DNA sequence: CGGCAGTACTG
DNA sequence: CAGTAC
DNA sequence: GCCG
């Protein structure tokens, strides 16, 4: 492997996406990426130059790390960048909000608790701060979404409910559920958050509630009986014509979405969560031209109007 | 030069 | 809207 | 940061 010029580049690449440079920190996610898993330690530039996702500037210090064992720039890291990365692991703030907080002289959770001014999300965020950063085993996954479905095919035994993310790809654990549900009668999806939700309240099993669309529920949840924590559960609700484009976007991964995202674009077309379609319209799309949607009834279809072998979900977890 | 996703909340 | 998250 |  390479862990020599990735352990150097990943401490960069942390300090970048914790002060909010997104897009460099892209640029090193995807080349720390590539040198995780090639074949072959690299030996010096032009191998490097010669990479895919690695550049002049991350050749000049693939070599730095080669030449000398050590690389200047990170004797250049700003001292905030442990605490940016304390306050940005609250659910709710992010670089912005962590940089304010580091400005006006706060340096702790005790700092933030005591004195800080915090949105309903983060307040909830911090009172759960180490559970939500904890991943349960998947089998603690598993009897979250039975939880969902018990409620939700109480009120419509023909809605689907499928646990989706790490738990969908086989992982061992899981950092919280997705739970997508659908129906295959085409609408009576519609208007079921308020029984739902409700009824998994009147449980107790709903503890808090983070983001409650119209579509798309956000909280959280704890189990029944002792040595439980709260868990992260998202739950999505979607037409039954989307359901292989959420079912895809929610399985992930994230990096796995974003390639497909930018295949699709080579060939004209966009993919989202709803639909595969084909482009609008330079770059970033047009101002007019809706773009037609492709048929993709199920995951199979997408990979194939993408040109692309199918994939299961264990072979996405990119 | 500029995209690297688009959309959903929250306030 | 900006910020955050998915 | 990467890339076209
Ligand atoms: N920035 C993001 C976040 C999420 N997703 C998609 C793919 C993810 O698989 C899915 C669910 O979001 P999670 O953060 O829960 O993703 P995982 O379940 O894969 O995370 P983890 O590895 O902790 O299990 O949403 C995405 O495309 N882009
Ligand atoms: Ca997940
Ligand atoms: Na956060
Ligand atoms: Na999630």
Redesign the pocket.
């Known amino acids: 492997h390479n862990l020599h010029i990735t352990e150097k580049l990943e401490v960069?690449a942390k300090a970048?996406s914790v002060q909010?440079?997104?897009?460099?920190?892209?640029?090193?996610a995807?080349?720390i990426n590539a040198l995780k898993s090639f074949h072959k330690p690299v030996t010096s530039y032009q191998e490097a130059?010669s990479?895919?996702?690695?550049?002049?500037?991350?050749?000049e210090?693939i070599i730095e790390i080669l030449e000398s064992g050590h690389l200047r720039?990170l004797d250049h890291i700003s001292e905030s960048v442990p605490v940016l990365e304390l306050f940005?692991?609250?659910?709710?703030?992010?670089?912005?909000?962590?940089?304010?907080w580091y400005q006006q002289g706060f340096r702790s959770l005790e700092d933030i608790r005591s004195q800080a001014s915090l949105?309903?999300?983060?307040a909830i965020?911090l009172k759960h701060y180490s559970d939500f950063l904890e991943r349960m085993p998947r089998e603690e996954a598993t009897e979250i979404e039975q939880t969902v479905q018990k409620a939700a095919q109480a009120f419509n035994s023909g809605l689907l409910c499928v646990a989706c993310?790490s738990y969908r790809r086989g992982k061992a654990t899981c950092g919280?559920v997705?739970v997508l549900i659908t129906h295959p009668d085409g609408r009576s999806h519609r208007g079921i958050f308020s029984r739902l939700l409700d009824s998994l309240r009147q449980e107790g099993f709903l503890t808090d509630?983070?983001?409650?669309?119209?579509?798309?529920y956000?909280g959280v949840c704890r189990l029944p009986g002792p040595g439980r924590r709260h868990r992260?559960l998202?739950i999505?609700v979607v037409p039954y014509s989307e359901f292989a484009c959420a079912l895809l976007?929610?399985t992930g991964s994230?990096h796995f979405?974003?390639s497909m995202?930018?295949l699709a674009?080579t060939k004209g077309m966009?993919?989202?969560?709803?639909a595969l379609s084909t482009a609008?319209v330079?770059?970033?799309?047009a101002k007019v031209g809706p773009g037609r949607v492709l048929p993709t009834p199920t995951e199979k279809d997408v990979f194939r109007l993408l040109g692309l072998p199918y994939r299961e979900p264990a072979e996405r977890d990119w």
Not at 282 to 285: C, D, M, Q, V
Request: glycine share 14%.
């Open positions: 960069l970048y909010g440079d997104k897009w460099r920190a892209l640029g090193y995807k080349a130059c990479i895919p996702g690695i550049g002049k500037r991350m050749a210090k720039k940005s692991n609250i659910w709710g703030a992010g670089t912005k909000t962590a940089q304010m949105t309903t999300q983060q965020g993310g919280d997705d509630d983070l983001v409650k669309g119209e579509t798309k956000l992260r998202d999505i976007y929610f994230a979405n974003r995202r930018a674009k966009s993919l989202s969560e709803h609008v330079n770059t970033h799309g």
